[PDB]
Copies of this chain bind each other. A is one copy, B any other.
Amino acid sequence: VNEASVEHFYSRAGLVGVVEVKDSGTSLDGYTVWPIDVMGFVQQRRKLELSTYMRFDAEFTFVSNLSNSTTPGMLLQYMYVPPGAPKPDGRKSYQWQTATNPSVFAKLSDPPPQVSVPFMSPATAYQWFYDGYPTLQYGQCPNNMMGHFAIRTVSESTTGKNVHVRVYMRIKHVRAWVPRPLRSQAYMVKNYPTYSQTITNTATDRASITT
């Protein structure tokens, strides 16, 4: 009864993204910018597309460690660049100091940080299916973007160790609108519906209709 519900069907934390700062090797950057995308994995893309419209709050958790699993104390900054704000160029860029970008300072020895992101869209609800041109652009609604998370180790110059991060998002206070079928065809491109020319059948074949 209550175990199948739109509130309970979109519930538990799941892995949205996997990022790496990687300043050790030929890549000396020491920072990364990760756009917030709920559809990055095809199985969570398919569940969110059971609804045309959704309105929810987000819960982000950052599980971070080095490559050998050891978590020595070292200081990281998790910033949040809301939609419409410029993204850092480098580790020393002045765009890490902006007071309107909320940031979290937490060591790798601490429990994983977590924060809540309110509903960001100008429209009443996120719409995963948009028909028409907003202004290649067919079906592309700019209202959905939730912003970015920029992550860097706080250091003067070039620490030689790579940091692996895993982001866990949890949908909260979810409301859904008009129902929609579940996709039969395999996804191809990230943003669009386009499907391969070889149509695969929904139901599996048998010898004859008798049995």
Report A's interface with B, CB cutoff 8 A.
Answer: 12-15, 41, 44, 63, 65, 67-76, 97, 99-100, 102, 105, 107, 109, 112, 153-157, 159, 164
Contact = CB atoms under 8 A, between A and B. Distances in A.
A64 to B, nearest CB: 9
B74 A70 contact: yes
Q: How many chain copies?
A: 2
Contacts of A68: 74, 155, 159
Contacts of A112: 105
Given A105-B112, A112-B105, A69 B159 contact: yes
A73 B70 contact: yes
Q: Which of A69, A72, A112, A154 has the most CB of B within 10 A?
A: A69
A65 B105 CA distance: 11
Contact of A102 (B12, B73, B75, B100): B12
A154 B68 CA distance: 8
A63 B96 CA distance: 14
Contact of A74 (B71, B75, B102, B155): B71
